[PDB]
Amino acid sequence: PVPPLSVRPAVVMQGSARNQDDLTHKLADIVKINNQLRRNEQNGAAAHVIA
Amino acid sequence: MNAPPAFESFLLFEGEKKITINKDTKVPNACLFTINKEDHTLGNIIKSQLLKDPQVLFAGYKVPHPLEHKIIIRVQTTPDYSPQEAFTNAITDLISELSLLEERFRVAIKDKQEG
Amino acid sequence: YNGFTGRKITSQIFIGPTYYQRLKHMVDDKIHSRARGPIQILNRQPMEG
RNA sequence: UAUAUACAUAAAGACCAGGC
């Protein structure tokens, strides 16, 4: 589950753009690697790299 | 930021009566005067002039609180002498004292200079 | 002598010059009052400080 | 003549100093 924007609000900085809560980074690190794990199993099905 | 104005002690704004007279139901012939914007200078003179009057059973003042400026003077007199009469004769007797003191202090000055 | 009534004070009082310090702590900087003001972003509760 | 200018933004965290 991915908790809603309320539970992980952004940070609006008038100086430059926005900052993001810890979860939004911690959830980005999951979606990156989950996707790398999507391709390997779908493309090469290489067994030792998945581990 | 909450400090009250300095002038707020001796100046009356709109609607404040100087004196407020309220009868006292505990006692016959008892009255209670309320003087706004005064302090122990004025209250103590009168109390001590009321206790010379042999028809005055009780007289006293208090400042209810020091940060608000008003005096509360209870007076109880003997029957057939009104506590408003007691408090007026007090004020006219000081004026007849202090007018005698200001004249006797002027004589002692002229005597004092070159005499 | 009493200041209000003029009369002496029965017990004798101990007076002398003494050296006092005024402290960084004043009431104007410690005073605070709150009614329906700013509100925290995440908790929707009142701000701190 | 009518009608209008209504409020939001300064993040959060860390350590340090002091208060009762």
> Which is nearest to B67 in space by CA: B14, B8, B15, B20?
B8
Contact at 8 Å (CB) between B9 and B37? yes
- CA B76 distance to own-chain centroid: 15
Per-residue DSSP letter, C47: P
The Cα C46–Cα C48 span in angstroms is 7
Assign a CATH topology to domain B1-115: Gyrase A; domain 2 (3.30.1360)
CB contact under 8 A, B40 and C4: yes
- Which technique was used to obtain these atomic coordinates? cryo-EM
Nearest CA in chain B to C29: B1
Structural tokens at position A21: 């809560």
Q: Give the bases of strand D that a protein CB approaches within 7 Å.
A: 8-12, 19
The domain spans of chain B are: 1-115
Count of CB atoms situated within 10 Å of the CB of C31: 9
